[PDB]
């Protein structure tokens, strides 16, 4: 058996992505119960990951932050053992804190400010334009600390 009483359940996470999400948004740094399922079967997606966090909720923006890694995912808001809300991540207009600007001469590396990038669906991929820099890179090359 497995069913949390109250919290959030991020389902349909791509493979090898669930762990990334865990260390990126450091979702494990909490006292709340967390059950994680990696490399699980799904069929409609082959195999997928699953993260469940009790007594923890995610605003729409927080859900959109997942868009970049798990686009076809589904965030289930759960309360009283029941799924009271179901939302899917949609491309956010910007990403903050999590990533690090690749431009070594950017003022963001030295000063006490949180990182921030504008998100742009360029074509084959997504382009990240630094709020400080004004230089834009492909999501692929823009690292995370």
């Amino acid at each position: 058996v497995e069913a949390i009483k109250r919290g959030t359940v991020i389902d349909h996470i791509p493979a090898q992505i669930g762990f990334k999400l865990l260390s990126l948004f450091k979702l494990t740094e909490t006292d709340q119960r967390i059950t994680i399922g990696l490399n699980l079967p799904s069929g409609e997606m082959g195999r997928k990951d699953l993260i469940k966090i009790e007594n923890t909720f995610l605003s729409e923006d927080q859900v959109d932050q997942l868009a970049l890694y798990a686009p076809q995912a589904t965030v289930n808001r759960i309360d009283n053992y029941e799924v009271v809300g179901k939302s899917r991540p949609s491309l956010p207009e910007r990403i903050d804190n999590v990533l690090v600007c690749p431009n070594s001469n950017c003022i963001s590396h030295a000063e006490p400010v949180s990182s921030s990038f504008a998100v742009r669906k360029r074509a084959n991929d997504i382009a990240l334009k630094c709020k400080y820099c004004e230089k834009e890179f492909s999501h692929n090359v823009v690292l995370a600390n």
Binding site: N103, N105, I107, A110, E111, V113, Y132, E134, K135, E136
Partner: protein, 310 residues
Amino acid sequence: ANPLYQKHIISINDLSRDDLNLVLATAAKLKANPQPELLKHKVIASCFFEASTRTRLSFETSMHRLGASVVGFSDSANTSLGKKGETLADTISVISTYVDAIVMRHPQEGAARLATEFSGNVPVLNAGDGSNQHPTQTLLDLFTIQETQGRLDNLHVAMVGDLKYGRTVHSLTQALAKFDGNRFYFIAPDALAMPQYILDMLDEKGIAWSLHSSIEEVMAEVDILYMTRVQKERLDPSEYANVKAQFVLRASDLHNAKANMKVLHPLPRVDEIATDVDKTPHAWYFQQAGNGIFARQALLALVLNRDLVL
């Protein structure tokens, strides 16, 4: 309150064709009728954490020209940020409690943007932030382009030199792209090419641009030949092959030049522009530099004074 009252001037990307037009118009009015007391009782900071001759001096001259007082430094080496390990943020946090406006040039991209987040109600004016933006340069550039061409649209513009690190061409290309029908010719080594985020922006507006290996190639159809200096101080050692200017304009290259064509250069110049060019009718970089006065008086007037130039 004019559109630019109490407003930060950080990137041309944040400005609109109207904002630009407003500065030029104001510059024209003030050049025609100076207002010596327009900014009396104002104290403005001139903070240059990076070398400068025209930008800092024309800016300070303008402040005095409008009756304001100036405080600041032209070298961070003796500020507490330079000798005591202080953050730029705390530096802005304290200076913004003394002045009415902050003019700052900095070696790192985004310094000006950063400052706006710690200045409070004190407007930050970007005098250059690394190889990113140089908003007041574009303003004086536009003033000059119109003074010599009669308009800011439907022009053929060639930008030569280091287009990658040239904060000058970044702002100017974005500004000229807010006007209609402009043709862009980019003459620069492949290593110092115009950044993609500029080209994309151009493609976005269906603006016509093309790369060229020589000046001769476009000398016949350019209205403005914009020369630039290789930003050696910003180059990575793995790009040191480009330190020496690839394109050197000599007086003898100006034969196919149209009578209206003018050579501009944000300056300083190393050898990209021979001195024999100086005496020709096409040379206009010193006139351009002088226009820095009017543009900067204009911007200052618009940001610190509520009503339009009465």
